[PDB]
């Protein structure tokens, strides 16, 4: 179980603090964007971009862009390899527009 | 003599930050927090 910030050693002289932002609160999106050194932007590959993903990026861009990394999940739900590649290509380029 | 005007500005900042470190390294620990305060990275 994880609740709230979690601080973990990541190296000899490096540490990280992980924080699961509540997905259903826009207020929680705003304040995290103002302190987040790094953002692991989770995206559902099968479904595509969602409002909460797009909304947060706009908040980050206006409050000072932090480092952003996109993470695509649920790719196994794709049944064809060809359509998987096309979806990955489309998502990546659109992500290259915001970041 | 720095090649570009950018390096000059960065040199000035770096020199100033370097000066800040020396005074704090000279400084006593109980005094230092009184002047600088609790620096980032301190668990408070």
């Amino acid at each position: 179980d994880i609740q709230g910030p979690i601080t973990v050693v990541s190296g000899k002289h490096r540490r990280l603090t992980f924080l699961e932002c509540p997905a259903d609160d826009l207020n929680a999106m705003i304040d995290i964007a103002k302190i987040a050194d790094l953002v692991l932007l989770l995206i559902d590959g099968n479904f595509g971009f969602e409002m909460e993903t797009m909304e947060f990026l706009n908040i980050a861009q206006h409050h000072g862009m932090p480092r952003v990394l996109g993470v695509a999940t649920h790719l196994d739900l794709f049944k064809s390899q060809s359509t998987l590649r096309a979806s990955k290509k489309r998502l990546k380029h659109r992500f290259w527009t915001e970041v | 003599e720095y090649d570009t005007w950018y390096e000059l500005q960065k040199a000035k900042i770096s020199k100033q930050l370097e000066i800040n470190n020396i005074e704090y390294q000279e400084m006593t620990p109980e005094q230092r927090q009184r002047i600088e305060g609790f620096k980032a990275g301190s668990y408070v």
């Binding site: 179980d1 994880i2 609740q3 709230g4 910030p5 979690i6 601080t7 973990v8 050693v9 190296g11 000899k12 002289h13 490096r14 540490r15 | 927090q33 609790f38 301190s42 668990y43 408070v44």
Partner: peptide
Amino acid sequence: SVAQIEKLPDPCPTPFYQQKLKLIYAPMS
């Protein structure tokens, strides 16, 4: 306004700092 403030020992010291002188620190959870 802060009523009081004090510094504490690091509860999750990094190995470089530790050897100079547990890897996870999750009090809320």
